[PDB]
Structures are given as structure tokens and as C-alpha cells.
């Protein structure tokens, strides 16, 4: 099964294969009724997102319905290089506007729900360099083909740190039915309406980590499949803020667990020469306070 | 405090800093009845432990009473090489006969207590590639300085992955108090027998924070104390491996704050090709089997 993968393949959970013999059009014809929306979360992007929304717009009134960026308030010209590549772009303001503006990227990813109309929302990170044209397709391949998936995870490989020291092996301690889950970080995913609202959106770079629990705890491990997309590229995140992301991890992942964490942000010491003759004391701000089912807000 | 501190200052729990004054004669008459061994953690380091006792060597009869090598089944010229820079090499089998080997790190500084006489027990890595001579006076001076110290930890910077982004995270989120401790896994630390006997021992790679916590628990901070060594350089720890030690701090440290561990190592997936096309399922081992206190075994 994992001896011979190709990008596209599904893997369910009684570790079992799925092989897509489908095109694109074909799987248009699956929709029956139900509609796509794909959401780009989008903060001081401009370089990247031009060529995200390229390799998704072909599908737009086709098997994608509406494809939006979700402006996370960026001061670069992140705006009005997305619409110029023909994307609607929503603002956490536009988005849902009677309630306040939290910090990070969960709030995004949850108020892009109250912004977008599908029943079935594919998430895609719009820091991608070069995505394959075929991610949105492989992402609602097991959704659409109905045998009880809910939450659709992907993996892939790099042409890492968080994941596989922070987010793998706390699963492995905690919740290990999802230790076969490769990469439970990854920004790109797809889900139903049903499940999205129903579920709290954990802050900042929890938010994958909580849905990805959330779902398994609520639905079970038959929920939820994998996709190979084969090699994904993305932006490098800088070392400094992998401190941050881990700890943001924790956080999420031990409060669905029904372990109280501190809510003390991590205090990272860096050495201010090359001698270490000081020390610049740095503390990161985390967040226990996740965000309500979408559905005891704005009730689609 | 942090904004100056000179190789060899002393951090204490209630934010106040103390740098030595002392020489390593001086050092020896503070000693005062109190016995003094240095125990080196050995395996497979044949390249580096010639080096690390030469720098502790003049300390022999001196300030330090006894000088041990704890061979944990080491293959290579390790035991033979230890011998000709002058130290006593006692094996795992040597060190306590009478209780089967369980592999580990942790196993080994467990028994090296067994096999070590002083009442205060040094522990310094043998993959240290040149380290300085004053790294034992260092750490036993706030011990043989009186004022309520039993753990003594070490802080210090490259001339990482695992202590920043698993354990001084999860330490946030846990035990926050402990947020100050700059090098929770590091390998050099000095403490009392009276503490080192009378706290259970964690296996592999989670010894080193389990120490930690249960001086912490039992005694509070003001029992740690940390000090400055440095520029530590070490053997670079494979990438491979630290994903497996990950796991093992976590298992540890849950185990610590009374957190069910589900005893389920890591699975890692490892991409055969370049196009991923294949994966290789690795399960590393994880262990909750602590050794109990010395005291319960061996009491001296
Ligand atoms: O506060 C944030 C942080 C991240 N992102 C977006 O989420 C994606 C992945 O973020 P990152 O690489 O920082 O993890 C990127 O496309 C970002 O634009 C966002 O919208 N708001
Ligand atoms: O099972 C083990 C693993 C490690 N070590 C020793 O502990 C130190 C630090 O180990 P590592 O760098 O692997 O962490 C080294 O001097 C090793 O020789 C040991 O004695 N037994």
C-alpha cells in the first residue's frame, strides 16, 4: 500500500488503498448538488499568490464554485495581485464583521467559513511555490466518491521540524489511532460544511491539529483519509518561529486531550554575541481560547 | 542579570546571580568531609572520551575523589582508550550484577550511582569535543557553596532541535516554573546522592528532564541552580534519531504530571525515492519504565 503510492492515491483508515481513475470533468458530474468553494488564507503574501490561484482558476465554474482569499489584514500588495488573477478577496472584517478581530491564523480559517457558501470547503495555503493543478481534484476525490469521509488530510515530501518532532510524536503519545496521519500540520485540506461548523477553530497554528482531533474524536479514524499530492514546495518558515508554532501545538492538542495547559508562553533566550556574554530574554505569545462552532454564530 | 553573565556565574531560582570567586584549590577545601565523583556516560565514543578526561584529569585527588566511565556496551576501542587517559571504566553488568540490563541512556547513569561513591555525583557527556577544564568546578560550586542546592543544570550556546521545540515548550505548557531553565536535556549537571538516590530514574534519552521534574516536585526551584559554561560543542546527534527522542521526552514528562502515556513509539514514514512514490513505516521504541529510587536497590 505505502510500497507503491502515486500522487492522487487515497489511503482510508482500515489501511486500505484507493487508486483515482477519474478527469476532472468526470468528477463534476459527482458533485450532485453539493457545492466547492476553495479558501486561500492569506497574510503578506504577494509574490506566491499570483501562481496559487493560476493553478486552481481553470476549475472556477467548473468543479470549483467560488474561489476566495482570506485577507488576514496584509499591509503588502497581497490584494490587488489576487484579484488581478481572478479571486474574490474577503477580509477578516468583511468576512464576519460583528465579531472582534483575533490574532493568528485560525481566525482566518474560521471566519472564511461565514465568507464562503460551499458544502464542501478545500483549504490551500497560498505560500505554495508552484502547486500542481490537481491538488484541489485529489483533495474532494474521497468526498465526493460517499463512503463516510468527512475530513480529507494530505501528504507529500519536500523536493518539517514541528511536525515530526512536536505534532507526530504527542499524537503518538496521546491519540495514537492518528499516528498513521503523515503530515497532521499540513495547510492542505478539504472538509464538509457539516463538520466545519460544528467543530471549535483553535487559535493561530493550532487550528489543523484541533480540526484533525476533532474530527477523529467526534467521528471516528473512518472520517478521515490521506492524499498523496506527490512533492509540495512551499516558503521556508524561519527557525525562530518554530518555538512559537510548537508551543501553539501544545497547547491546541492538550486542551482536546482534557489536559490543562498554563496558557505561559514559551521564553526563548537567544544569544545575543558569539561569545553568549548576554542573553535576549523572548516570550511568545500563546492562545487557549479557540473559536466557537461556527453554527452558534452564523447558522448557514 | 542575563544581560551580563561571564562562563561560570550562578542562576538562582529567585533571579539572583552569583559569579565565582574562587580557585579549583580553594574549591577542594569547601569540600569539607563531602566526597566528590565524576561519572561519564560511554557508548561507542572511542574518538572523544580520551579528550574529555584529559580535561578533568588534574582534578583527580584533588578536588575530584574518583573519576568513572559507565560503558554501556560499547563494540569499539572505548573501554581500552578510557583506561590510558586514567580513568576506572565500569560497565552496566559491572555497575549493579544482581538487576538486568535494560537498554538506554537513563539505565546507565541509574546504575553509574551503584558503582559511584562520592556525595556528589558529576555527570558530563563523552561526546564532548573539547571541553573545557573548569566544567566539574563549575557545577559543584553552587553545591559546596551551602545555601539549599541539589541540582545543579547547565546552560551554554553552539559554537538544539529536540530542547527548543519539545522540551522547554512542553516545560512552558506543564510545569511553567521551569521556564526559566535554559538546557533542561542537557547532559552536564551535578547533584547530591541524598536526591540522586531517592528519585526514580527515566529510561533512554528522558532521563536528563525527569531529574529535573522531580527535583522540582519534591524540593521546589530554589533547589536548581544553573550555571554558565560556556561555548559547548558536542557530537552532532543525527536527524534521524531525534524524532525517537522526542518521543521519549514526551513519554517522561507526561509521565511526571501525572498524564497517561499510551506506551505507543513513534511510527515515522520515510520517503524511499525522490518522487515519494514508496515510504518506509519505522516504529521507534518508547519506554514508561522508570527505575526506582537507588535506595530501593542498593542503599548506601
Ligand atoms: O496569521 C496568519 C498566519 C498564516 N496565514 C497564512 O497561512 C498560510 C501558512 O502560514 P505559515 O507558513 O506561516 O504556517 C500562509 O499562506 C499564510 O498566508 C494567515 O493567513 N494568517
Ligand atoms: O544508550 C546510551 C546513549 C547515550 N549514551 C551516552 O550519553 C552521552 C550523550 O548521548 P547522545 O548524544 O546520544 O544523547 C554520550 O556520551 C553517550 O556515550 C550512553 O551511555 N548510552
Known sequence: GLRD????????????????????????????????????????????????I??????????????????????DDTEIRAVAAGARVVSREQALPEVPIRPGKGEALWRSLAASRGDIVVFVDSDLINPHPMFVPWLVGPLLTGDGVHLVKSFYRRPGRVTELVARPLLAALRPELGCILQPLGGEYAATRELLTSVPFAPGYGVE????????????????????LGVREHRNRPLAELGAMSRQVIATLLSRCGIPDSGVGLTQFVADGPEGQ??????????????????????R
Do not use: C
Open 278 to 299: 548576554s542573553y535576549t530574554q523572548h516570550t511568545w505569545p500563546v492562545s487557549l481560547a479557540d473559536r466557537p462552532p461556527m453554527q452558534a454564530i452564523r447558522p
Open 54 to 75: 493560476d493553478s486552481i482558476s481553470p476549475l472556477v465554474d467548473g468543479l470549483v464554485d467560488e474561489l476566495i482569499v482570506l485577507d488576514s489584514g496584509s499591509t
Open 209 to 228: 491539529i484541533g480540526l484533525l482531533v476533532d474530527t477523529f474524536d467526534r467521528l471516528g479514524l473512518d472520517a478521515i483519509a490521506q492524499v498523496n
Open 5 to 52: 503510492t502515486r500522487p492522487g492515491d487515497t489511503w482510508l483508515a482500515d489501511r486500505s488503498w484507493n487508486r483515482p481513475g477519474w478527469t476532472v470533468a468526470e468528477l463534476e458530474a459527482a458533485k450532485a448538488g453539493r457545492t466547492i468553494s476553495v479558501v486561500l488564507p492569506a497574510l503578506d503574501e504577494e509574490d506566491t499568490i499570483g501562481s496559487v
